Design a protein around this ligand. Structure first.
Ligand code: SF4
Lengths: 69, 72
């Protein structure tokens, strides 16, 4: 899907830790989203840091430059 | 739908997401804004970014810090 391709493109712009956070959050890698707590344990990040990673990633995904109209 | 007329569709998407690296990316923000300035749906883009709360990136000819200062 075009969503898939754009999602991987966006993930490539992130640091390794940020991309891992996003993949665990949305369950992109193995199909299981993880709770904020487990993501924090795995990557040593705060709930707030996860939220800002997710906000930036969503902004990149929804930006009209990448839009699937 | 205004997104059909977005001219950033023909640009590197990362242009619209400058990373501050020990300081404001004034040049990259300007380069993105130059695209927005030749865009026919700039008011629509900005309106959508503000109404949906897009906190990161350059939308509608405004940087993220500028939009953030607009909403308290
Ligand atoms: S105003 Fe800028 S970000 Fe919005 S669609 Fe036009 S070129 Fe893209």
């Amino acid at each position: 899907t075009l969503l898939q391709d754009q999602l991987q493109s966006v993930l490539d712009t992130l640091s390794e830790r940020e991309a891992g956070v996003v993949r665990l959050r949305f369950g992109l890698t193995d199909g299981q989203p993880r709770t904020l707590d487990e993501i924090g344990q795995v990557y040593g990040v705060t709930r707030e840091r996860i939220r800002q990673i997710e906000s930036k990633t969503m902004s990149k995904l929804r930006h009209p430059s990448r839009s699937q109209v | 739908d205004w997104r059909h007329k977005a001219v950033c569709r023909d640009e590197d998407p990362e242009l619209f997401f400058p990373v501050g690296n020990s300081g404001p990316a004034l040049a990259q923000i300007a380069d993105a804004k130059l695209v927005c300035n030749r865009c026919p749906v700039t008011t629509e883009c900005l309106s959508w970014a503000l109404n949906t709360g897009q906190d990161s990136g350059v939308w509608g000819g405004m940087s993220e810090d500028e939009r953030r200062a607009l909403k308290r």
